[PDB]
């Protein structure tokens, strides 16, 4: 499993990489929106922790692109600069969850797993609609 | 087009009835939980303006219900007791939007037009 962290707080970002690695997750981080767009345009990540407020671009912008491009990618927005409006917009754009700083590690872990579960059911169901609709539905 | 208003405040509830009428809409209030639970078990409203904290029930629950029952009725939770977790939750359950009090009427209205528009590009799809 791949998790792209996109925080710029040298410490928090570091702790995550460090923590999540024990779990057994290939992690790759990024300071700014660019290091992110580079990495998200080379490799494919399942999950993405997304700091809302970055120096060069606004979180959502990235969110949008990620979804609009690789929807099979579950994005968890984590921010210390959030608002109900801003969180609702995040959700509306297709973001599994929206965590608020401070946020315990263990939870970030949980939310990542749930994020994976979801990204998966949606798969299975998408497979059935093919099994159904197609297969045993073709005049069969 | 219908509009089920689930506010427990005479002032906002009323104010909401009197406004949504001038537009040209069948609006119907609801003081508490069951009141609304019944009218939804009786008729079908396009849009529902659920309020989060009611006396008896916890609005979300109603939102839950409205979706598992008739998942075509769009809900717009407008409240004054909102928290990002709640809103993030409400969203993850069905809510089209999650508006905060105070909220100008125009914005509430408009957030209903945009609710149906989105409640349409699905019938087509
Ligand atoms: Mg920052």
Burial bucket for residue B1 (CB in 10 Å: 0-12, 13-18, 19+)? middle
Q: Please report, for the domain that includes residue A74, its CATH number.
A: 3.40.50.2300
Domains contained in chain A, number: 1
Cβ distance of B97 and A88 shorter than 8 Å: yes
Q: Is A97 annotated as a binding residue?
A: no
Cβ distance of B84 and A98 shorter than 8 Å: yes
CA distances from B7 to A50, B27, B35, B77 (A): 36, 12, 11, 10
Q: What is the resolution of this structure in A?
A: 3.0
Contacts for A20-27 with beta carbons within 8 Å, 24 or more apart?
A20/A108, A20/A109, A20/A112, A23/A109, A25/A1, A25/A112, A26/A1, A26/A2, A27/A2, A27/A3
Give distance in angstroms: CA of A55 to centre of ligand 1. Answer: 8
Q: How far apart are CA A137 and CA B102, in angstroms?
A: 52
Burial bucket for residue A24 (CB in 10 Å: 0-12, 13-18, 19+)? exposed
Owning domain of residue A131: 1-140
Quote the DSSP letter at residue A53: B
Q: How far apart are CA B123 and CA B113, in angstroms?
A: 16
């Amino acid at each position: 499993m791949n998790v792209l962290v996109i925080e710029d707080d040298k410490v928090f970002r570091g702790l995550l990489e460090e923590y999540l690695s024990m779990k057994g997750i290939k992690v790759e981080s990024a300071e700014r929106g660019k290091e992110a767009y580079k990495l998200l345009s080379e490799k494919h990540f399942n999950v993405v922790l997304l700091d809302l407020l970055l120096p060069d671009v606004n979180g959502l912008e990235i969110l949008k692109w990620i979804k609009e491009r690789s929807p099979e990618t579950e994005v968890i927005v984590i921010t210390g600069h959030g608002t109900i409006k801003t969180a609702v917009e995040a959700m509306k754009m297709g973001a599994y969850d929206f965590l608020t700083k401070p946020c315990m590690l263990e939870e970030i872990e949980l939310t990542i797993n749930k994020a994976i579960e979801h990204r998966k059911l949606r798969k299975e169901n998408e497979l059935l609609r093919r099994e159904k609709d197609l297969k045993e539905k073709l005049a069969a």
